[PDB]
Structures are given as structure tokens and as C-alpha cells.
């Protein structure tokens, strides 16, 4: 059994006016781009690699649980830190 | 003892035998370890017999 | 309390050797000088003087029942 | 056994020591303790019958 | 100078010296004399004076004051409207079942106040409250400070160590009961609760009336998460922290968080402690909180006034007493409660760890003084609660009133005896409630006994409890409380007696230590504010948060060096400086166990060769412990400074120039040798055996038989045991000639053969030398003694005479002309079984006897008779009676290692074998019994035994000597022409064939068991019978029978013998014949002699069936019809 | 990341909870008692370090060097003053999920230098 | 229903009465009383108590222990031996003399 727990080192969250202000130096937000407080969880590479997840899966699983009551916009499986965004929809 | 000592004479191991005698660490910690097989034979049978 | 009158083990008289072995303590004599003055070979003989404790002493201290 | 036991702390007190799979770092530096004691014990008794 | 390799006699020497300067019961003694001293004056002093009006009014009422203080207390005196009354000896209180107490005496003084504005004030001197029993030897007990002789002349033993008390002539002792520490905080986690982490203190003020007001400061296990609460004494519910200080009277935010994060840079305390903060912004001002502290309030008020009232006092007294009860606390409390908060928040995140239960710092011990200072103020509550009941009763009229007769004396008394007789440690009435095995009946069958009985601690937990985490043996109990001593029952590890020199403290005032802290450089609470806080350290005196220091060295170094020049601090106060967290504590309580270490300097000891010489010419300089002491040589260190301090076992072995261990020594121990308790120091060579085998042996010393005291004679007391001959060991330990073994030893250095010799030692058993029996080895003497008084009704007058046959109607078989015509036996007269020894007639309203029969089987000889007076002035008999044990087969012998057994056979000396001498061995144990219970202190005994009755020298058996080893002795014994492994060339003794393997013999140091055979031996064929169910008596004196219990039957079910079951459930217990009718099965009516048989609710009178029936079952239906339940048995 | 830090209202001194000023889209702390506002500045309301990477070094203080109990060696020197001698010590802390990793302390006292090896 | 002398013994001058016959004392006093008032006062106030305590000592004359309730004790403060603590578990009638 593995819970988000697990494989998270931090969270935190922000009040981003602007989703595309992107008020952490995030070049994958700006290239991929309704609320501005919004949520931060940092993971780490060693029990997902551990546990073989990906972040499409991570969402996926979010977006079956929750509905689309929220858009989760995960990072890249390249860059060194380990990022997925959490907003609510309106 | 020395604060954090994990060596073996600071955690129970005996290096002496019944005829060189115990250091008096050792008698104590062996003292202490044959108490647990004490209190176990008193206390098991109130279980063993029920 | 007292003195046994005859060693446990050996049965040699001992009742009699307690005063002399105390007046030998009395002088320069160690234990194992009196036990052998006295004549006591076999340690059996030996401890009934060397590990005596004479509580009679002790127990003439109280006065008597009667007078 | 001793010498043993020591350079083992200090592989585990330089973070030179490597917790096993399915163990902490703690229980591992515990089981190799155990481990180089129970052994030690083992050949000074084999030695005793010999 | 420095004193290398003379250790081994300076540390005894020194040793020595605190033995004889204090004793062996100095615990019992300072802690009764400290209570009778001034806890007593406290408690008589603090109790407010009433005041009492009249009812309300008498037509269409002033009040008095009635203090009083100043305690007086006298010597014991004994007589009472017969003579002038005289001085009570205690061995007269033990003779004639007298209670060893002694009267008590205040001053009071009533002012009353009518009319007229004038005031008269009548003071009554030496008001008479009661008499107070009172400990022997103690300060103002009638045998204090009496040289030997003096002693000896009232018939008293010197080497008696007191610590007891007589009461109805039996001795009893207090044994200290344990308890959590008060006034300091804990965090603990249980495992499965609504909340996770709990921190609590249970308070006490300055032994105040009110009890232990424990307060719980606990966070929940998990929306928002994590909330703090505070369930509270006098609060139903559990109540959040930031209410209690609102209510408290802090109505910002910012001050509370002062109070209990004292540096706000930290944000991860404040991510924890918001949770908390949410949960009660609705309350904002004081008086809100108040309300909902009061709602929440076991009496909840009417109205918000009442609820704020009651909420206030709650505050105010009921919650952390110690900190302070006054006007204006809050501050100190908040302060207080804000660092329990602190505390538990530290554990929550894990900057810190959790409290250990079983840490004996942790711990304090209730001795005889603390005991009997919570009961006499309970009982002095009750006498002053009837004092003015009494008041009432006579102002309510206001006639007047006398305060002579308003004093209950009895109260306090008869409270104190009765507790102390009993056990039963409260008010009479709650004896199911107060908790029992406190002052039981002194344990007089050996001297180590009496000491090891007198030294003796208690925990109060639940035995029979598979929680084995409070018995295990800690490791706080290093030299203060003894691991190898402790019983094998269900009381393993609760039950623990106290080390040779640990000491426990008897409490003092910490104001002088107040006074002194703060003058140097220190602020209390209301002074500085919290920004100053975070950077120094917490001062805590006795619990309570005193101040804050910024410079915690030099102070710590100035506490010392006070306490170790005794200027201000006294010796047994502990200062305690916590170093990663920064609380710095002081501990002055009672109850805190210690023991006496040795002070190091850079790597030296201060215990110098000047000390040594100028303490062993001692009773000439008289340079004794306590000046030792006084020259700051060494301290006493309980647990809380032992976890603070690094301890060296010996100076020589580890304080040299080697590869560093520590190098940073501060204390080092006199003798490791006294971690050991008083029936565990008289183990030789106890590092060489398995710690259940000394386990056993500490417990078997308290049941060897020797010369117990040495007055056993004038004392009249059952079930005394004394050895003919007993002997000092040979082999001894260097802590028996402070236990005063050598003076009163229990047992004889007999020779023995580990050898299988027939057989019949096979199985832990024994074989004896039947000459050395003969000439006196182990012979014993058993007294018991009887007693008896004659009194009870109107006309129902006991009388002692002879019972006349054609007078009195009742008698036995047993001849009675072994009586004398007053009605006893004259000493010296052979007695047996079924044998009257008190002639005792009640009158018949001719008459009926009550004569004391001899117990069954005894079979001895009238030693002493004794004829006196009881307290009510009747006539009180108590004779004691001779009756020598022969050692016989199957009697109890034991050694010093825990290797007992009963003997199997007893040879003659020519049956027995024997070396090139003539020496045959006095005892042969199999040597099936060393390999697996490893007792090789055993066979190392038994070496040095010989080699010690060789040399002439007393053989030495220290524990940790290191001196000697078996090379060394082997050595020494192969000087004096035996085999150097101690083995010995046997021969048989029926064949005289030297036996093929070499014997191991030699003199080892047995002693002799009170469990004879000839006391537990017994029979039964249709003896006597109970009466309630007609089944067999229990017991070996009445005669009673083995019970078939319920295993019993089981494997006879197993054996599938069911006429065998029948046989003992049914007839061999209790045959019975019972008739029902055949239409109910409810037993009918029989009358047999006219063959008239009905059953009531039937009227048939001719179908009855006769069944036959246990009594036990006839009983158990009849109990289920009066339950209304209608057990129903058809024969069809 | 960082962590969080509460600072309390300057009227009555009181915690501040976030607030959104929905017309210019910006945060703003709010106490709930009075009708004070403040702009933040950091602009992070909660963070929570589920890893707990933890950097013992700051919760060790410097008097722990006078503790008579601890063990002490000369091999490892300290960095800033050069001083031979060292106190070194483990976590001592709940909750260190694998750490044996010593943390060492200098003596000299007004040094109170703290590093890890 | 009242046990015989067989159920609760009188031992004679320790004569001394058992504790399940001082309850049935207890039971008859009250009773007896109740049964008096009730025709002569008829008050229908002192009837309540007076029924609720005869319920107590009677429900603690087969059952001495309940929660909540107080214990029905003997003088000097000992509690009572009901039916049910005779011949409830271990040292009971069945267990022990069965």
C-alpha cells in the first residue's frame, strides 16, 4: 500500500494571482499554459522510482478521484525537481 | 558509560565467563537480563493455566 | 552460641581448645600459629575453632530470669 | 570481535555503512552487532568443547 | 597524597565509616523523626481556625476563634488511674501486648467575642490529643542513644537496628511505597487514545491536605488536525489550552504565545500551535472563558456569576497547587502551564524524547515519615470536623461549651494504631478502598531478615497484571536498589529491598536555597519579559519554575560548591542541570533515593592518604562519615544528577594515562560491591554464579534458622527459630562485618562431597552425615508461644483453673493434671499433642471450658511461663514452648548460591565416604545440580573454604575484589598438599574401594531452612468437618483435608476413572441423602423415624423418590431457590 | 521553499489569517477581530516538509560542550579557531529516521562552533 | 423466598448471625414497615422511597455488586456476601465445592 505521503517531500501553497504570473520561476507552466490560490506538492526521485508512478498517472488518479474539480499540472519527468500544480475549478 | 556507546561491553555482552568473574557492569546487566526470565516464569502461568 | 563439644565432621574434642585458642589469639600468635599449637591438622578440626562466633558472651550480658 | 564491532560503529558513524533492504539503518548496524557477537560466542564456546 | 594500590583497604576503611556512622535503618529512623519533628508541627499549624455561630438568630450571633499551635510531645509513659504513671520500656510493650506509643500535647487557645466589644482570650496548656505510637531507637524513643550495657539491662538486643514499631506487642514496619514523582512534568504517548502525546504533573503543595491534583495537557491524534487540550481536576471535559489562559486572564494572543514558544523564529512550533489558536477564536475576553470553563465544571452553575465563581476557584487552587495559591498567581501559572505546553509540543515534534515511567528519577519513596504524615492529617481533619460538631451542639442552646470534653483523644489514636496494626493505610471505613501491605509484621526468623524487612521498597501497581515492563529491573536501579534481591512469586520486581549504602532523603525547605539563587545574577518570572527568555535557562526548585539565569555555568559550579561545604544547601538536596534542553532543576522533596559517590577533579579523587589515616585512627580524632562529608570529599547522587554525571567503578582501573575512554570523570565509586542489597551481600563470590541462582538465595536467607537476637529468650514470641552452633562463614564477603553477619550468623561451614554417592541426592537432593547429626550438626530449637486472657460479659467470667470434671460440663480426652491449680503448666514439663496447657472456664449461665489446647503434632517442652496484665487490667498469659529439630530427611538445607534441597538420606560416619583421613563429608550434594544452574561461586566457595580452614585465615569473597581468582586459590590450596583443583581421593565407605573419579570436596557454608518436614506433614480419615457445607477443613492444624481441585479432576476424566471421581467428589468429601418428590423436582420433607414422607405443593405423600447427593450440590440447589430459580430433578 | 512565520496584528495583537482582496486579486492578512489589513510579503500561507530533511545543526546549541558525559577525540578538528579537541555526539532526536551520523560540538569556550562529518 | 439455617449457619458466641441473614433482617424491617405505612399513613411519598429501598436491599441480597449503586455492607464497612458472590466464580459453590 503507498499512499501520496509516501513519495512527497514537501507541500506548500501560494496565492498566485495570475496562473500564467507563475510566481515560481516555472518555465514548464509557461510553456504549458479557474483560481488564483492554488497548490504546490514537491516529490522526489527516489521513491518514484522506487514505486515505478509517473505524473500522468499520479493525475490520473487524482482526476478519478476528485472529478474535474480541480486540474493538476505536473512537470516533466526531465527536469530535476519533481513538480505538480493543484488549482479548483469554477 | 559514555553518552551513544553502542560497543559491546556497553549493551550486555559478557566477555568474561562464571570463572573469571563478572565486571561489575556485566553482573549488573546479567541481573538485569535474568529478571526478564524470572518475571516470564511468574507471569506465564496465570495465562498457561487459564 | 557455644563452643561445640566435638568436631561435626572428625568427632576430635574441640570443647576444651576455645579458651586455650583465645588466650593464643591473646599474644602474637596468628590463627593458623594457635590452630596447630593446639593440635588441630585437619581443617575439618580447624574451621569448628576459626569459624566460631561465641555468642554466650553476648547472651550473659542479660540478667538472669531468677536470683 | 571487538575490533570489529568498533570499525563497524565507525563505518556507521561516517555514514559509510549501508542499511539493508527491508531495514533501517538502526536494525541493520543492530543485526551486524548481533551478528559479529553471536558469532564470536559461538567459536569461543566451539573452542571450549574442542 | 594520592593513594595507589591501598584501595582495597581505604575504600572499606571509609566504608566502614559510614556504616558506623550511620546505621542500617537510617532511612526509617531520620523519616519517623522528621515527621514527629516538624511535619506534625506543620500539619497542626496549618489547619484553619473555626469559627461558629448560633443558629442565625433566637428572637426577633457572635462567634469565637479557638487557635491553636505549638505541639508538645513526651516520652513514652505507661499507667493509668492505678499508679503514677511511669515510662513505657518496649520490651515490657512486647511482653504484655502493649502499643509502644507515645501521648502528644498542644496548646490552645480560645478567644470568644459576645457583646460589648471585649475580648477574652483563655489559653489551655498541654491539651491532651492523643498518643502517637512511636518507632524504636528512634530521637525520642526510650532506647536512644543507651550504651550496650544499658541496653543489655532493660533486656534489649544492641545489635537490635530498631525502625520499627510495637504495637499490641507486635513489631511493625512501614515499607516505603513508590509513586511518580511530583510537581514535574511528563510527556508520554499512549498507544491506542483519541490523542497521541499526553503531558502531565501531578501537584502538591507543601504537604497540604489536598491530594495529588494531577493536570493533563494532551494533543489529539488526528481538516485542521492536531488541537491541544487540557483536561483539568473538577472538569468533566477536556478543555483547550488558549481558553485556559484567556481565562486565566491573558485576553491578547501574542502574550499567550510568550508563554509558551519562547522564540518566534522558529515557524514550525507555530504551525503546530495555530491548530490549536483556530479553535477558540469565539473567546476573547476573560470572563467568556470563565463561563465555558464552568459549563464544562462537575457542579455547573445556575448562572454565568456562579459558573465565573466556581471557575475562578477551580483556577485558583485546585490547578497546579505548587506553583502557588495566592491573590495574584496567574502570571507564575501561566508561565508554568505555557512551558507543559512547551514540553509536550517539544515531544510532538521530536526535539525531544519521552519520559521514561519506570525511571526511578522519576520515582519517590513514601517512608514511615511521609506515610504517617498523609494519615495523621486525615485523622487530625476528623477530629477537628467533631471538635466542631461538638461546638455546634452546645452553642446552638449557647449555654458554653468545655473544649476538654469537645477533644475526641480516642480519634487520633486509635487511627494510628489501627492502620499500623492492620495495614489497611486510610479510614477505617474505606478498607476495601485504602490500599494494603503497608507496616506489616516484622520478619524475626534471622538478623538479615529483620534488615532485609527493614530495608525494604513497594510498588503500588496491581500485582497479578501481564504488564511485565514495571517489574523488569531498570537501569536507575544501579546502587540503589539491589538486583539480585527480590521474591519469586507474583511480586517479582515490585517487591525490591534497598542497596547497601543508597540513602533516601528526608526533605527540607528549599526557601534558604531560594534566598541564595536569587541574589547573584538571576530574574523571577514578573521581571523580565519573554524576548529574554529563549537565549537562557529555566530554574526549576522542587518542580516549580522558579526563575531564569543567563549564565548557567557558575552557577552550577557554585551550587556544589555550596552543597559540597554543606554552607546553605544541605547534602542531600540534588541540583540537576540539563545541558541540550535547558532546564536547569533543584530538588529538595522527600523521597528522593540517593547514595554516597566520591568527587573527581581533573582525573584525581579528593579522597586523599591524609583522609585515610586520619579516619582510620577513628573513636580517638572522631574524624567520622559526616566530617568526611563536610571536607567535600563526597556527595550524594540520586538518579535525576546520576544521568548528569560520568561515573569510574574503580580509580585505579580508570583514571590512568591509556587510549582515552573519557578522561572527563566527575564521580567515582567507593565500592562497586554495594549495588548489592542485605541478604544479596552475603553471597560469596555472587558475580561467579547465574543471577536467578542469587535471586534464590537473597530469598532463602530470610528463611535460614540462626540465633535471630540475641534477647530471644525474655522475647515471648511464636514462631521462633535458633541454631545450636551457627558459625561465621569462612569464606566471606568485606560487607557481612557491616551487616553483622559474623555476629549473628545463620548456618554451619560444613565439608561437602559433590559426588554421587547411592543415589539419593539424585534429583537436588542431599545427603547428611548421621554422626555429625549426632553431635550436634544443624540441630535447632523451635519456640512457639501461646497466649491467652481472661475477661467479656455481665456474669461471663473467664477464669484459669483447673477444669474440675463433675463442674465444668465440656471437656476433651487430654488430662489435665499437667495444669496447675491456677490453670497453667509449670515450665519445664514434657508436652504432647492434645495436651492443655491454659485451663481457661467461662461461666455456664455449670461451666464451660475454653482451655488452649497444644497444637497437634508438636510434641515439645514448656520453656517459660509469663503472668501479667493486659491494658484493660485483666489477667494475660503467655507461654512459650521448647521443642528441638533434629535434622531428619527431607528437612530444607540450602547453601549461599541458591542450591537448596531437602535431605534424602542421613549415613552414619562409617557409611559415608572418606579421604586419606578420616574426614568424611558432612553433606553430599549430586553434581547434576551445578551445570545447568551454574552456580560456579559454588565450587569457587567450596575451594576457598578449604583453603581458607588450611591457611587459618578467613577466606575473602568480594564480588569485584579482582585480587584473588581460582588460579590464585588453587595455588594457595596445592601449598598445603591437596590436589590444587580442590579434588580429593574418596573411598567407599561399605567397600573401601577408593572410588574411581576423584571427589571434589570441601568446607562450604550451608545453611538450615525453617521448612522442616514434621511442620507440613499431615493426614486425614473423616476428621473434622465445616459447617456451612459439610465438605472436609482446610488446613494442616484443624485437621483438614487435600482438595481435589478442579485439575484433579480433569485428569481423572483424562484417566477415564469415573467410579474413582465419584469416589472422591461424593463419598470420600461429602455423602448425602436427599428426597423430591417424583412430580416437581423440589426437595421434600422427611420424617424418617415415622416413615412420613410429603411434599408440600403437591399433597401427594406417596410417590417420593430418595436420591443420593454431595452436600455441596444439595446447598448450591437450595441457594439457587432462594435466587427464585427452581432447580427441578425427576428421576424419570 | 522555507517555512511559514505567524506575526500578529498591531492593534490588539491578535493572529492574522489570509485573505483574498478579490478586486485587485492580491493576498492580504486579516485579523478577524478588527478591521486591520496588511499586504504579504511572502506570499507562501502553508508549507509542510512531509520528508523532513531536517538540518540538526541548528536545534544543537553550544553549552552542550561542558557535558561531562559525552565522548571526546582530538582527531577531528574545529574549522573556524583550529581547537584540537571536539565534542561529538548523535542526533539525540526523535523521529531521525536513519541517522547514526555523529554531530560534533568544539570546546573552547565563545567558539561554540557546530559541523557535521 | 428465605434460606434455611442449612444456607446460613449461626455460629454461637463467634451467638453471631450470618450476612446474608442480617439482609434478610434488612428485608423484613423494611417491609414490615412499608407495610404499615401504607395502611395507616398511606402518605404516597415516604411508600416511594420506602419501596425503592426495599427494591435496593432485596436486588443486593442476591447481588451485593452494581454499578452505580452503593454496596450493602455489614458493620465495620464490609461489604456483603450475596447468593450471586457465593456461588459466582472460583472459591464459589460450583467451582470450589463442586
Known amino acids: ?81 519533481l513538480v505538480l500544480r493543484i488549482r479548483i475549478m469554477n | 558509560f559514555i553518552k551513544d556507546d553502542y560497543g559491546p561491553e556497553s549493551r550486555g555482552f559478557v566477555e568474561n565467563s562464571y570463572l573469571a568473574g563478572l565486571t561489575p557492569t556485566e553482573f549488573f546487566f546479567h541481573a538485569m537480563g535474568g529478571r526478564e526470565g524470572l518475571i516470564d516464569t511468574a507471569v506465564k502461568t496465570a495465562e498457561t493455566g487459564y | 552460641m557455644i563452643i561445640p563439644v566435638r568436631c561435626f565432621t572428625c568427632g576430635k574434642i574441640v570443647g576444651n581448645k576455645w579458651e586455650a585458642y583465645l588466650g593464643l589469639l591473646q599474644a602474637e600468635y596468628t590463627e593458623g600459629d594457635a590452630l596447630d599449637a593446639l593440635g588441630l591438622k585437619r581443617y575439618c578440626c580447624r574451621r569448628m575453632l576459626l569459624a566460631h562466633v561465641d555468642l554466650i558472651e553476648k547472651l550473659l550480658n542479660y540478667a538472669p530470669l531468677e536470683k | 570481535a571487538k575490533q570489529d564491532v568498533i570499525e563497524v560503529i565507525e563505518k556507521a558513524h561516517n555514514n559509510e555503512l549501508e542499511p539493508t533492504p527491508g531495514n533501517t539503518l538502526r536494525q541493520t548496524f543492530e543485526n551486524q552487532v548481533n551478528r559479529i557477537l553471536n558469532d564470536a560466542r559461538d567459536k569461543t564456546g566451539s573452542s571450549a568443547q574442542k | 597524597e594520592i593513594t595507589p594500590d591501598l584501595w582495597q583497604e581505604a575504600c572499606w576503611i571509609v566504608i566502614s565509616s559510614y556504616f558506623d556512622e550511620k546505621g542500617l535503618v537510617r532511612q526509617q529512623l531520620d523519616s519517623f523523626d522528621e515527621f514527629i519533628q516538624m511535619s506534625v508541627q506543620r500539619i497542626v499549624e496549618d489547619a484553619p481556625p473555626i469559627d461558629l455561630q448560633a443558629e442565625a438568630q433566637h428572637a426577633s450571633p457572635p462567634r469565637y476563634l479557638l487557635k491553636f499551635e505549638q505541639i508538645y510531645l513526651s516520652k513514652p509513659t505507661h499507667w493509668e488511674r492505678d499508679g503514677a504513671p511511669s515510662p513505657m520500656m518496649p520490651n515490657e510493650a512486647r511482653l504484655r501486648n502493649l502499643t509502644y506509643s507515645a501521648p502528644l500535647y498542644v496548646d490552645i487557645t480560645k478567644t470568644v467575642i459576645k457583646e460589648g466589644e471585649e475580648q477574652l482570650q483563655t489559653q489551655h496548656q498541654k491539651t491532651f490529643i492523643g498518643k502517637i505510637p512511636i518507632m524504636l531507637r528512634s530521637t525520642y524513643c526510650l532506647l536512644n542513644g543507651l550504651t550496650d550495657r544499658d541496653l543489655c539491662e532493660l533486656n534489649e538486643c544492641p545489635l537490635d537496628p530498631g525502625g520499627y514499631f510495637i504495637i499490641n506487642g507486635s513489631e511493625k514496619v512501614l515499607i516505603a511505597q513508590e509513586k511518580m514523582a511530583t510537581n514535574t512534568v511528563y510527556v508520554f504517548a499512549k498507544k491506542d487514545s483519541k490523542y497521541a502525546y499526553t503531558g502531565e504533573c501531578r501537584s502538591c503543595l507543601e504537604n497540604s491536605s489536598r491530594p495529588t491534583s494531577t493536570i493533563w495537557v494532551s494533543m489529539l491524534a488526528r481538516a485542521i488536525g492536531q488541537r491541544i487540550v487540557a483536561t483539568l ?216 531478615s529483620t534488615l532485609s524487612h527493614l530495608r525494604r521498597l513497594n510498588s503500588p501497581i496491581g500485582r497479578d497484571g501481564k504488564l511485565a515492563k514495571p517489574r523488569q529491573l531498570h537501569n536507575t536501579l544501579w546502587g ?112 528522593r533515593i540517593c547514595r554516597p559517590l566520591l568527587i573527581v577533579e581533573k582525573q584525581k579523587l579528593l579522597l586523599k592518604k591524609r583522609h585515610i589515616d586520619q579516619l582510620k585512627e577513628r573513636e580517638y580524632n572522631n574524624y567520622s562519615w559526616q566530617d568526611l562529608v563536610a571536607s567535600g570529599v563526597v556527595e550524594y547522587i540520586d ?116 559426588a554421587s554417592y547411592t543415589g539419593y541426592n539424585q534429583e537436588d537432593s542431599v545427603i547428611m552425615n548421621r554422626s555429625a547429626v549426632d553431635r550436634g550438626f544443624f540441630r535447632s530449637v523451635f519456640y512457639r508461644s501461646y497466649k491467652e486472657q481472661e475477661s467479656k460479659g455481665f456474669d461471663q467470667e473467664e477464669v484459669f483453673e483447673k477444669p474440675t470434671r463433675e463442674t465444668c460440663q465440656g471437656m476433651r480426652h487430654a488430662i489435665y493434671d499437667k495444669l496447675d491449680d ?60 521448647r521443642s528441638v529439630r533434629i535434622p531428619q530427611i527431607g528437612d530444607k538445607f540450602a547453601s549461599r548460591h541458591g542450591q537448596k534441597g531437602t535431605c534424602g538420606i542421613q549415613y552414619r560416619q562409617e557409611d559415608m565416604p572418606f579421604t586419606c583421613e578420616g574426614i568424611t563429608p558432612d553433606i553430599i550434594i549430586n553434581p547434576h545440580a551445578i551445570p545447568s544452574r551454574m552456580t560456579i561461586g559454588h565450587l569457587i566457595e567450596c575451594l576457598q573454604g578449604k583453603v581458607s580452614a588450611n591457611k587459618g585465615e578467613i577466606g575473602d569473597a568480594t564480588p569485584f575484589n579482582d585480587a584473588v581468582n581460582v588460579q590464585k586459590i588453587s595455588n594457595l590450596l596445592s601449598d598445603y598438599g591437596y590436589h590444587l583443583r580442590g579434588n580429593e581421593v574418596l573411598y567407599n565407605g561399605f567397600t573401601g574401594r577408593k572410588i574411581t573419579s576423584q571427589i571434589f570436596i570441601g568446607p562450604t557454608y550451608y545453611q538450615r531452612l525453617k521448612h522442616m518436614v514434621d511442620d507440613k506433614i499431615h493426614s486425614r480419615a473423616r476428621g473434622p468437618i465445616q459447617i456451612l457445607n459439610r465438605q472436609p477443613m482446610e488446613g494442616r492444624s484443624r485437621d483438614g483435608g487435600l482438595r481435589f481441585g478442579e485439575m484433579e479432576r480433569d485428569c481423572q476424566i483424562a484417566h477415564g476413572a469415573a467410579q474413582f471421581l465419584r469416589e472422591r467428589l461424593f463419598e470420600a468429601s461429602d455423602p448425602y441423602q436427599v428426597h423430591v418428590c417424583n412430580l416437581c423436582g423440589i426437595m421434600a420433607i422427611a420424617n424418617t423415624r415415622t416413615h412420613t414422607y410429603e411434599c408440600r405443593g403437591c399433597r401427594n405423600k406417596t410417590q417420593i423418590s430418595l436420591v443420593r447427593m454431595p452436600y455441596a450440590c444439595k446447598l448450591l440447589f437450595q441457594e439457587l431457590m432462594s435466587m427464585s430459580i427452581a432447580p427441578r430433578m425427576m428421576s424419570v | ?85 571536539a565534542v561529538f555526539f548523535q542526533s539525540h532526536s526523535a523521529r531521525a529516521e536513519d541517522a547514526m551520523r555523529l554531530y560534533y560540538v568544539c570546546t573552547a569556550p565563545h567558539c561554540g562552533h557546530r559541523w557535521t562529518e | ?50 419501596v425503592k429501598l426495599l427494591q435496593f436491599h432485596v436486588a443486593t441480597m442476591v447481588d451485593n455488586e452494581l454499578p452505580g449503586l452503593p454496596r450493602a455492607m455489614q458493620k465495620s464497612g464490609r461489604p456483603l456476601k450475596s447468593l450471586k458472590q457465593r456461588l459466582k466464580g472460583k472459591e464459589g459453590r460450583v467451582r470450589g465445592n463442586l
Open chain 5, 822 to 881: 491456677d490453670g497453667l503448666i509449670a515450665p519445664g514439663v514434657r508436652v504432647s499433642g492434645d495436651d492443655v496447657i491454659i485451663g481457661k472456664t467461662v461461666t455456664l449461665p455449670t461451666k464451660r471450658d475454653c482451655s488452649t489446647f497444644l497444637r497437634t503434632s508438636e510434641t515439645g517442652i514448656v520453656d517459660q511461663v509469663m503472668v501479667t496484665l493486659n491494658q484493660e487490667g485483666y489477667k494475660f498469659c503467655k507461654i512459650r514452648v
Open chain 5, 480 to 591: 540503589m536498589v539491589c538486583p539480585a534481591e527480590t521474591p519469586e512469586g507474583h511480586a517479582v520486581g515490585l517487591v525490591k529491598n534497598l542497596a547497601l549504602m543508597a540513602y533516601i532523603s528526608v526533605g527540607s525547605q528549599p526557601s534558604p536555597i531560594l534566598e541564595f539563587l536569587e541574589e547573584w545574577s538571576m530574574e523571577n518570572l514578573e521581571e523580565i519579559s519573554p524576548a529574554a527568555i529563549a537565549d537562557a535557562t529555566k530554574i526549576f526548585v522542587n518542580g516549580c519554575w522558579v526563575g531564569i539565569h543567563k549564565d548557567p555555568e557558575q552557577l552550577m559550579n557554585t551550587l556544589r560548591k555550596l552543597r559540597r561545604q554543606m554552607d546553605i544547601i544541605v547534602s542531600e538536596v540534588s541540583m540537576i542541570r540539563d545541558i541540550r534542553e535547558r532546564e536547569i532543576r533543584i530538588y529538595t522533596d522527600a523521597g
Open chain 6, 1 to 85: 521553499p522555507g517555512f511559514v512565520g505567524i506575526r500578529f496584528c498591531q492593534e490588539c495583537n491578535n493572529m492574522l489569517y489570509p485573505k483574498e482582496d478579490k478586486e485587485n486579486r492580491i493576498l492580504l492578512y486579516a485579523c478577524r477581530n478588527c478591521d486591520y489589513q496588511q499586504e504579504a510579503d511572502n506570499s507562501c500561507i502553508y508549507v509542510n516538509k512531509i520528508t523532513h530533511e531536517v538540518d540538526e545543526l541548528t536545534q544543537i546549541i553550544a553549552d552542550v560542550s561542558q557535558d561531562p558525559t559525552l565522548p571526546r577525540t582530538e582527531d577531528h578538528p574545529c574549522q573556524k579557531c583550529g581547537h584540537k579537541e
Open chain 5, 639 to 754: 538518579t535525576l544528577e546520576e544521568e548528569t554525571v560520568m561515573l569510574a567503578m574503580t580509580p585505579d582501573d580508570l583514571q590512568e594515562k591509556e587510549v582515552a575512554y573519557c578522561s572527563t570523570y566527575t564521580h567515582c565509586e567507593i565500592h562497586p560491591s554495594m549495588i548489592l542489597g542485605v541478604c544479596a551481600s552475603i553471597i560469596p563470590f555472587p558475580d561467579h554464579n547465574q543471577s536467578p541462582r542469587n535471586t534464590y538465595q537473597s530469598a532463602m536467607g530470610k528463611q535460614a534458622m540462626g540465633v535471630y537476637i540475641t534477647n530471644f529468650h525474655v522475647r515471648m514470641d511464636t514462631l521462633a527459630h535458633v541454631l545450636y552452633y551457627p558459625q561465621k562463614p569462612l569464606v566471606t564477603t568485606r560487607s557481612m562485618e557491616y551487616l553483622r553477619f559474623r555476629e549473628l550468623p545463620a548456618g554451619i561451614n560444613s565439608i561437602v562431597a559433590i
Open chain 5, 233 to 448: 481536576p473538577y472538569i468533566k471535559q477536556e478543555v483547550p489550552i488558549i481558553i485556559v489562559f484567556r481565562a486565566l486572564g491573558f485576553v491578547s494572543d501574542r502574550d499567550i504565545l510568550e508563554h509558551i514558544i519562547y522564540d518566534f523564529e522558529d515557524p514550525e512550533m507555530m504551525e503546530m500551535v495555530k491548530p490549536s489558536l483556530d479553535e477558540a477564536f469565539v473567546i476573547q475576553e476573560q470572563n467568556v472563558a470563565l463561563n465555558f470553563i464552568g459549563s464544562r465544571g462537575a457542579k455547573p452553575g445556575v448562572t454565568k456569576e456562579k459558573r465565573i465563581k466556581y471557575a475562578k476557584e477551580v483556577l485558583q487552587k485546585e490547578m497546579l497547587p505548587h506553583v502557588g495559591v495566592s491573590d495574584f498567581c496567574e502570571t507564575k501559572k501561566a508561565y508554568f502551564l505555557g512551558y507543559m505546553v512547551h514540553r509536550l509540543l517539544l515531544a510532538a515534534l521530536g526535539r525531544r524524547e519521552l519520559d521514561d515511567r519506570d525511571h526511578y528519577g522519576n520515582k519517590r519513596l513514601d517512608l514511615a515519615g511521609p506515610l504517617l504524615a498523609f494519615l495523621f492529617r486525615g485523622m487530625f481533619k476528623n477530629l477537628l470536623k467533631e471538635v466542631r460538631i461538638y461546638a455546634q451542639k452546645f452553642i446552638d442552646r449557647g449555654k458554653d461549651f468545655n473544649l476538654e470534653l469537645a477533644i475526641k483523644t480516642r480519634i487520633i489514636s486509635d487511627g494510628l494504631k489501627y492502620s499500623l496494626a492492620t495495614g489497611n493505610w486510610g479510614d477505617q471505613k474505606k478498607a476495601h478502598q485504602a490500599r494494603a501491605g503497608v507496616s506489616q509484621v516484622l520478619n524475626r526468623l534471622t538478623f538479615a
Open chain 7, 1 to 50: 423466598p428465605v434460606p434455611p439455617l442449612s444456607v446460613r449457619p449461626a455460629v454461637v458466641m463467634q451467638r453471631n448471625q450470618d450476612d446474608l441473614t442480617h439482609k434478610l433482617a434488612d428485608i423484613v424491617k423494611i417491609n414490615n414497615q412499608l407495610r404499615r405505612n401504607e395502611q395507616n399513613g398511606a402518605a404516597a411519598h415516604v411508600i416511594a422511597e420506602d
Open chain 1, 1 to 81: 500500500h503507498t499512499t501520496l505521503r509516501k513519495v512527497t517531500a514537501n507541500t506548500a501553497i501560494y496565492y498566485d494571482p495570475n496562473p500564467q504570473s507563475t510566481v515560481v520561476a516555472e518555465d514548464q507552466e509557461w510553456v504549458n499554459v479557474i483560481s488564483p490560490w492554488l497548490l504546490r506538492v514537491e516529490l522526489d526521485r527516489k521513491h518514484m522510482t522506487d514505486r515505478k508512478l509517473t505524473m500522468e498517472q499520479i493525475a490520473e488518479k487524482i482526476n478519478a478521484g476528485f472529478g474535474d474539480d480541480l486540474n493538476c499540472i505536473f512537470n516533466d519527468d526531465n527536469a530535476e525537481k
